[PDB]
């Protein structure tokens, strides 16, 4: 609240300093921000505690940055950490005390939890509460009465209005409890699903699962883990532990196929007990319990087949022990979020690898599913070797003079097709691909503009893939990329980042970018995180290049796009010039070639 | 360096400066490798010796050391060819110099220099001294232009500010001496005191200025005896740099926070720590003020926390490269005053004018293909006179 002569807020008169400050490695700002030391001997203990009570926002190598909020404190109380159980240790760890504001915030957040519990039974959602005064003073607003369908006091609530009531309670200071007591539940018989000994659970996976299962009752929340880290394995383990009917929701056909494959590989459950509620292929969804479908499958708003109506009505009628939702970052979308209310589930676990978006709808996920349970430390995984180390880089390509002339001259938005296609970046990517090709490194080129992708691919006579590409040709190209030594590069369009199971690649070049999309950046980066059989963290075998054009809007998009990665800790090194480019022969070495490309770009319209 | 300072002097001032007490010893210590030995050798000789002996008294290997030492001491005029006997005055004084004839102080020096830097920056609370203010103003690192309003800080001021304490103080004293001659204070008398430290009206005023700078402290109500501080004769880092342009500095003295705020955006200030961000706005602000990326990198490196000393390089490459690129972008467009030529009837005349401009140094850039060139306004008069002369 107090501002120094500079931008920073002043806290000299706010909180004191502990005498044994050097012993205490923890800081506590009044706003809730906490700065932990990664060099302290008790760093691991501090990390566990701060991860339990707070969500990371920046975890560089030296000083980690956490911030706590109501949802994080609720998650701590869910794993059973009382207000004293957290605040006492926070004061002990803190080297400068705990401001009264944070003290009262912690007390209020912890006490305002568990008073209101939401439990669904016999397809009816009852708002139970041991304390009656909470309901007595909670029925002030008319929205509660109109929402409601027309000790331990409970009342049934309308299915459709659950989301609205949930978001209302969040700001009403009475969060709802979505814990599932699968251990004590006889209404829905347990499913015959077991985890085979073959599956191996990594320490971070076990920690995330423990945080989800803080007690005997499973907690509904979001666990953010890298795509290469085995989030599919974690989800399968969660379903197996729940031992009740599970409905996994993908985002595309490849996602549903991979989820079925993961279920069979890691769970002893029989093949016949798994169904694919997909229009292209139906495996008798009503016959068995464990189901895999997608958000468009359930939330579809327009006409439905008669068979799909029967399946949908069966799904609505039945109650699900677990509702796994992969790629939760798309949930707050209108149609996708309608699925949450369409289907009934005790705990709706959420898995993803890039929980970031521009529109401030990510906060809605906290109430749509639950608080962010776990968020794996990418740097720690890199050190442990679970994830391949990446030498993140941004190759700056100077724009050609004529291209810049038209780019600046026109105030329209042909620049997206212009600066994405310039001779300098073309030569840069050509040289980079040549260097890695002679180095036997697998290349996965990326480009949002299909026009630029096709032009680059034809000029380099490479197998470019994109949306309307036939499925058979897609599979043939991927198989050749994985097996044929003669080919070691594939030029994938935006479809690549959506969802796929692609072979591990040693480099990932990105000539163009869709825009300032942290989601797309992280999604594409996750491709090369696939750990090799015997690599090492320090070898930096994996590389990521995000080619950008200097003095262009692409620079703004790149800088705005690398925020999530730098927050994780990756250091994007800038490369002004590439050694050996002048000696190596490359296309567009003469003005005429650039002129023809420019004429084609102008004629693109 | 002190070698530069003494090299830039006349023989008449040199021999006088070679005072009996200390100068002959302080200038001796300056002698890097071999001149010391040669001085001791020809310290007891009253007969000059041929130059060939000195030339051949160093083996073929490492002869460049012999040449450089001889040139340096020829500049100092310690001897004369006399045809290489040393100066008789220096010989006698050196023979007289060779068998012939605190914890609170360092803190005081630190505090006094810190308050001086606080005044140097726009600190509302600082020590007031009109003589110190005017001295810094005429030192070339500050300009007021309005006695009523407090003086501001010039471009050179920021560069001086970001320098390390040793170099900062040494340059400050160099400017002190140069301005001492301008104000009329005898240079030799004040200079000899500095040498005597490492072992009149002008002396009292000079000692007052030194005590103001914090190098000395009488401690006895300005008595004749003085106890020089450590800085008179001539530490761990605290900043931690992340990979996301974030600085966590364990600073309690406001001076360090101000120095960091000169090129970073401050976010939080804890009792024993402060958080700042190195953004384009702050870095380009400093570069516009006059700083260059080298000073910022050096400052962050020297004030480097021990935690990041283990990693090599100490400063992350991304941070260093980003700072350098940010400074470069500012001077992408290089401005240079000049005068253009047009309508060259013949290339022979243009080439002759180009040769003349090259000889005089007037030319700044030339274009043979377009038959044109650019000349600075200073050389515009010269080239115009040449054209008039035809």
């Amino acid at each position: 609240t107090k501002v120094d002569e500079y931008g920073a807020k002043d806290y000299r008169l706010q909180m004191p300093l502990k005498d044994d400050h050097t012993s205490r490695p923890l800081w506590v700002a009044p706003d809730g921000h906490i700065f932990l030391e990664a060099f302290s001997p008790v760093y691991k203990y501090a990390q566990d505690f701060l991860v339990a009570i707070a969500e990371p926002v920046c975890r560089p190598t030296h000083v980690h940055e956490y911030k706590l909020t109501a949802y994080s404190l609720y998650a701590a109380v869910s794993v059973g950490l009382q207000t004293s159980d957290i605040t006492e240790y926070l004061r002990k760890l803190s080297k400068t005390g705990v401001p009264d504001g944070i003290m009262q915030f912690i007390k209020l957040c912890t006490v305002s939890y568990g008073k209101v519990k939401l439990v669904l039974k016999h397809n009816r959602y009852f708002v139970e509460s041991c304390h009656p005064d909470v309901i007595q003073h909670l029925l002030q607003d008319p929205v509660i009465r109109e929402c409601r369908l027309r000790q331990t006091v409970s009342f049934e609530v309308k299915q459709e209005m659950i989301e609205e009531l949930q978001k209302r309670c969040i700001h009403l200071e009475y969060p709802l409890l979505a814990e599932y007591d699968f251990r004590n539940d006889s209404v829905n018989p347990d499913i015959n699903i077991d985890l085979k000994p073959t599956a191996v659970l990594r320490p971070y996976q076990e920690k995330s699962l423990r945080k989800m299962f803080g007690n005997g009752r499973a907690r509904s929340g979001v666990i953010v883990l890298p795509c290469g880290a085995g989030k599919s394995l974690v989800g399968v383990t969660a379903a197996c532990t729940v031992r009740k009917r599970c409905l996994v929701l993908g985002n595309s056909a490849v996602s549903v196929e991979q989820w079925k494959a993961q279920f069979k590989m890691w769970s002893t459950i029989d093949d016949s007990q798994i169904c694919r509620f997909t229009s292209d292929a139906k495996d008798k969804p009503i016959g068995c319990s464990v189901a895999i479908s997608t958000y468009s499958m359930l939330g579809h708003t327009t006409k439905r087949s008669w068979e799909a109506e029967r399946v949908m009505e069966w799904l609505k009628t039945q109650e699900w022990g677990l509702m796994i939702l992969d790629e939760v970052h798309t949930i707050p979308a209108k149609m996708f979020r309608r699925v949450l209310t369409i289907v009934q589930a005790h705990c709706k676990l959420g898995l993803t690898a890039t929980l970031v978006r521009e529109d401030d709808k990510i906060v809605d996920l906290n109430f749509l599913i639950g608080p962010k349970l776990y968020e794996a430390n990418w740097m720690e995984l890199q050190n442990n070797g679970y994830i391949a180390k990446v030498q993140c880089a941004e190759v700056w390509c100077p724009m050609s003079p004529e291209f810049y002339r038209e780019y600046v001259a026109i105030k329209t938005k042909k620049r997206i097709l212009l600066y994405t296609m310039n001779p300098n970046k073309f030569r840069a990517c050509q040289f980079l691909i040549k260097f890695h090709e002679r180095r036997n490194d697998k290349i996965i080129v990326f480009a949002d503009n299909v026009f630029a992708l096709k032009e680059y691919a034809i000029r380099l006579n490479k197998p470019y893939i994109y949306g309307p590409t036939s499925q058979g040709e897609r599979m043939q190209i991927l198989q050749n990329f994985k097996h044929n030594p003669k080919i070691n590069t594939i030029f994938i369009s935006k479809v690549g980042d959506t969802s796929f199971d692609l072979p591990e690649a040693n480099v990932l070049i990105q000539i163009s970018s869709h825009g300032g999309s942290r989601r797309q950046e992280a999604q594409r980066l996750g491709r090369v995180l696939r750990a090799k059989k015997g690599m090492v963290a320090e070898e930096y075998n994996a590389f990521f290049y995000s080619l950008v054009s200097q003095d262009t809007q692409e620079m703004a998009y790149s800088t705005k796009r690398q925020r999530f990665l730098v927050d994780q800790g990756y250091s994007f090194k800038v490369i002004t010039k590439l050694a050996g480019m002048e000696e190596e022969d490359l296309a567009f070495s003469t003005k005429e070639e650039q002129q023809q490309l420019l004429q084609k770009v102008l004629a693109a319209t | 360096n002190l070698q530069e300072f003494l090299g830039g002097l006349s023989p008449g001032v040199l021999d006088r400066l070679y005072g009996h007490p200390a100068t002959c010893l302080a200038v001796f210590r300056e002698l890097p490798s071999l001149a010391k030995n040669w001085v001791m050798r020809m310290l007891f000789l009253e007969q000059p010796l041929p130059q060939a002996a000195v030339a051949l008294w160093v083996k073929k290997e490492f002869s460049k050391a012999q040449e450089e030492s001889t040139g340096l001491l020829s500049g100092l005029r310690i001897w004369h060819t006399q045809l290489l006997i040393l100066n008789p005055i220096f010989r006698q004084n050196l023979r007289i110099a060779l068998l012939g004839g605190v914890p609170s102080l360092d803190k005081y020096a630190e505090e006094r220099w810190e308050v001086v830097l606080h005044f140097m920056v726009g600190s509302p609370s600082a020590a007031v001294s009109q003589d110190l203010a005017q001295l810094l103003s005429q030192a070339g690192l500050m300009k007021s232009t309005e006695p009523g309003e407090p003086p501001c800080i010039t471009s050179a001021g920021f560069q001086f500010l970001l320098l390390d304490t040793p170099a900062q103080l040494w340059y400050f004293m160099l400017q002190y001496l140069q301005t001492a001659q301008s104000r009329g204070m005898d240079l030799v008398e004040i200079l000899s005191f500095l040498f005597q430290l490492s072992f009149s009206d002008s002396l009292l005023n000079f000692l007052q200025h030194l005590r103001e700078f914090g190098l000395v402290f009488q401690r006895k109500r300005k008595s004749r005896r003085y106890y020089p501080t450590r800085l008179a004769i001539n530490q761990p880092g605290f900043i931690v740099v992340e990979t996301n342009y974030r600085l966590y500095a364990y600073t309690e003295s406001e001076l360090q926070i101000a120095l960091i705020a000169l090129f970073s955006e401050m976010l939080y200030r804890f009792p024993n720590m402060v958080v700042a961000q190195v953004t384009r706005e702050s870095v380009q602000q400093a570069i516009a003020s006059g700083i260059t990326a080298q000073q910022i990198i050096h400052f962050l490196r020297t004030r480097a926390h021990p935690v990041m000393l283990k990693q090599t390089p100490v400063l992350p490459p991304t941070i260093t490269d980003q700072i350098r690129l940010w400074e470069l972008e500012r001077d992408r467009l290089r401005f240079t005053e000049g005068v253009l030529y047009n309508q060259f009837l013949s290339q022979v005349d243009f080439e002759l004018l180009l040769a003349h401009a090259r000889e005089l140094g007037v030319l700044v850039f030339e274009n043979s293909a377009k038959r044109l060139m650019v000349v600075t306004p200073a050389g515009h008069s010269d080239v115009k006179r040449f054209w008039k002369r035809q």
Binding site: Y540, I575, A579 | P317, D321, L325
Partner: peptide
């Protein structure tokens, strides 16, 4: 063998 490229090993900025 399998050594990192020059432009990633060391800063390519002119400084």
């Amino acid at each position: 063998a399998k050594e990192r490229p020059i432009w990633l090993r060391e800063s390519t900025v002119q400084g």
